[PDB]
Symmetry: D2
Subunit: 297 residues, 4 copies
């Protein structure tokens, strides 16, 4: 009864070259996702360094994702979150006007809105567009938590709001959400627990690991959606070691390191305050990667 964006999705890294977005590398990486079974891509979330891109660069990345996915089955769920509602509304409207299929919108970071404030924030965002809106709860980064009651209120009050990406390590809340509002789309935002969230009726993932292993994350998700829980769990178990090492330092530091280690990006460049991992973690990531089958271009 709602328009939705579900399935296996990738929180795209943003490659830099000489401090600027490498727009050619960005398109090439998206094509690699498309060719490895991914159902949607998410430009410029946390993994794509939304904090340090300018609003102009953020918009360019959304445009490249839309352009690269045009004529393919793959949807663009554009990163559009902000701690300021007026900025989040501006990004939402841009995404809509520029052909995104939907938006992801992180809970406001830093300023710690109340539940009433979160409700008004997301209602303003939903009112600004006519495309699907996925909430995104990540309290370890934002300092706030969108409660189950608030999520369900938004889902019932706002046609566009169709679910939530949960990055909260809280499978109890995942049960609470789908037991009380089974129509919503619960999306895993934590790779290590993709299979538990899917096996409780979640309908997709927004993945960091899929930057490196898109075929494995897509296979996992599609097995679970087909109720082949044995085969989905097998992949989730196999992926635990890489899923864990990709957070040995704050995301996206390990995943960009891994993409560089596999020759998939040309330089290991971040924007401050992000920076290279320690040499010890660089080497740890490399050793974990050697246990997995990494697709090229």
């Amino acid at each position: 009864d709602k328009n939705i964006i579900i399935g296996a999705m990738t929180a795209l890294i943003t490659p830099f070259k000489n401090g600027k977005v490498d727009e050619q590398s960005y398109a090439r990486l998206i094509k690699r996702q498309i060719e490895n079974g991914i159902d949607a891509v998410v430009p410029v979330g946390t993994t794509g360094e939304s904090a340090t891109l300018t609003h102009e660069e953020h918009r360019t990345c959304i445009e490249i994702a839309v352009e690269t996915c045009k004529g393919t089955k793959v949807k663009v769920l554009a990163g559009a979150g902000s701690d300021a509602t007026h900025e989040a509304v501006g990004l939402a409207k841009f995404a809509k006007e520029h052909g995104a299929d939907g938006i992801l919108s992180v809970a406001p970071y830093y300023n710690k809105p109340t539940q009433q404030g979160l409700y008004e924030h997301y209602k303003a965002i939903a009112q600004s567009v006519d495309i699907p809106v996925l909430l995104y709860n990540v309290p370890g980064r934002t300092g706030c938590e969108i409660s189950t009651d608030t999520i369900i209120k938004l889902f019932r009050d706002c046609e566009n709001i169709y679910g939530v990406k949960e990055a909260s390590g809280n499978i109890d809340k995942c049960v609470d959400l789908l037991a009380h509002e089974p129509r919503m789309m619960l999306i895993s935002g934590e790779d290590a627990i993709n299979y538990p969230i899917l096996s409780n009726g979640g309908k997709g993932v927004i993945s960091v690991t899929s930057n490196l292993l898109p075929d494995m994350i897509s296979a996992l998700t599609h097995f679970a959606l087909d109720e082949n829980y044995k085969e989905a769990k097998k992949i989730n178990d196999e992926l635990y070691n890489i899923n864990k090492i990709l957070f040995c330092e704050s995301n996206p530091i390990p995943i960009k390191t891994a993409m560089y280690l596999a020759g998939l990006i040309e330089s290991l460049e971040f924007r401050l305050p992000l920076c290279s991992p320690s040499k010890e973690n660089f080497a740890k990531i490399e050793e974990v990667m050697k246990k997995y089958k990494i697709k090229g271009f």
Copy 2:
């Protein structure tokens, strides 16, 4: 000699739907008649094992004599049925935990549950030595139990796995930790162990990841539902197991609106399954507001009698 290759050797296991039994009091004493009646009710409603005197059974405030009496009643009531007794045997002192383990073995328990030491916060090395001493003292199965919110310590995944591999009788862990990532970690690195849900609201997610049973609070009140849930999941009927887990969320949540076992004893009293709402200090009755919340949540569930 000791060795590191026990993981695929015969570990007698105790799995399935299990109940963390409340301990009813009458005039301050254990009501042994009521205790037996309650265990019989679990047996008649599909439960696979009972756990006398865990946290839910007020292990902290029973004397060592009363703790042993409850184990004996559980063994006697389950004798001749298929239902096993996984006796609560944990302590923050290794010498007390070894004493309880030996008692359980000598008095016919099928296995023991053994909570991580509370209060004194041992290191991982100390936890390893604690559980090695317990496992070496008996020849019956030992289930570890991690509940960091109550103990102040955590048995790490690496320590759990070492104990499983290093000790013949340690066969798994009951997790009450709100940490489905750790549940994945445990079974991805040591799939031979028995992961047991210790948090009712997430029984189905743990079982669907390959956990093999539950040690339940809710089953004191709704044994039939918890056993049906567990057995559906063990049969890989995940649709039907999830349906019950979802239906149970409201009661599963309200049973922790105050520290367990305050809500479950309140519910058992409200349903007419125990005669008085009695605890031993420092536990006590819930607030009037929470008493009323529990009563309202219960109206949506069909409560079996005796």
Copy 3:
């Protein structure tokens, strides 16, 4: 060349009683007239410095243009008085934080406050490089600001001390971390730095351990009391400083019953110091119950007007 021995070299410091200024809105826009009037009221009530556009001033929802306008109003209103402007200049993007730092320098601020990056959780190495870039971009004092409950990250004691020793202009930290152990750690290992209280309820404990000022929310409402408290403590009149800190506990606590600045703007509205109770989303009015709690707590304090 860079070096590691800045600790005893001239660090121009900004210390004393300071106010994290609220930013009043009128019809959604910054009310620049009200802002100036409020700053003048701080000046006339003993405050040593003002902090435009920190967390309390809704830095997240001001545009970069409005943020700069508020810095300019603060500088102009304090010109010719002894009161200094420690401009809010923090960001989760180093390039934005450097831009704000340079603006503050070029537009006459006396120094900058710079919050640890929120949301993107940089490593300690990244925080070091962040603040090195900021400090190297200007020649005015830089105060670090740690508030892990809002940012999701913590500037460790070792990183703070390295920055103090390695950068000429970094002179201390504003701690809003509920961690008096860290306050001891900081000043026991680097007593030359300026530790500034960022949590009003514990202003006196931080000052009595050798902290040298406060960056206050409560002083928006009670500037006289917060400045008197701070100045008593700096004079080693701990008895009189503690007396005020104790008297202020109730208002200090209620001003965080919802996320700052929701309660302080509510109180400023209730006292008649701002004309409308307006925030920018995602901030909004308090619940009716908390509005009423704030109003009741305020009745015990004598509120200065203009």
Copy 4:
């Protein structure tokens, strides 16, 4: 208006010899506390391994402390806490009948009583004796927190209850307590922050560090009680490094290690589940100790 036990106090380690309490070593260690300015000793708290002593051994330790302090100015604040009220009442009555000056009583661990339960627990304990009772809040070990409201209610409702030993890293609560009930005795239970608690009007410490450095902890406390905050802070600052290293593993593992390293106990023996520190932390403790002046016997 209340009888109180305040000043510099030591949470006594319990030495073992061949697995039994070394009663001669215990007395010798208490005499060393007496001769180095300490105002009271606390037998068998957390630091004295209350969890693994038997009830008989616990009682023996209280008796040795009372006997050794008789005829000196030093008081015995006997450890008497339990997670079972009936056990805590039994210990309280024993201490009273055996000549202790007061009791310390830890908040119930493991079973997580509600505030009403904590109130009834401590009221039962206070009703059982006619000597002073000090509450003890240590949420990191017990899993519960005695709220300020509950502490103040107990102080006002129970003559014997005269204050609280706080081990909660919460100087805000320390302000809350003494601003609303300035008659109580707030006692520092965390060595690193002894000086902040004293300078806000706390009136003593129950120390781990004083096992090793009793003269320094007593000097610190007495300077603060005399309003010589400069000299108290100086000692608190000097002690930070040892105060921190004594919790590099769970107390009392480091402090027993330090006492062994200084030749003050003959064997580094614990009762399971406590055990020796790692060899790396053993060496770290030794290196920190070399910066301090350690009194002998």
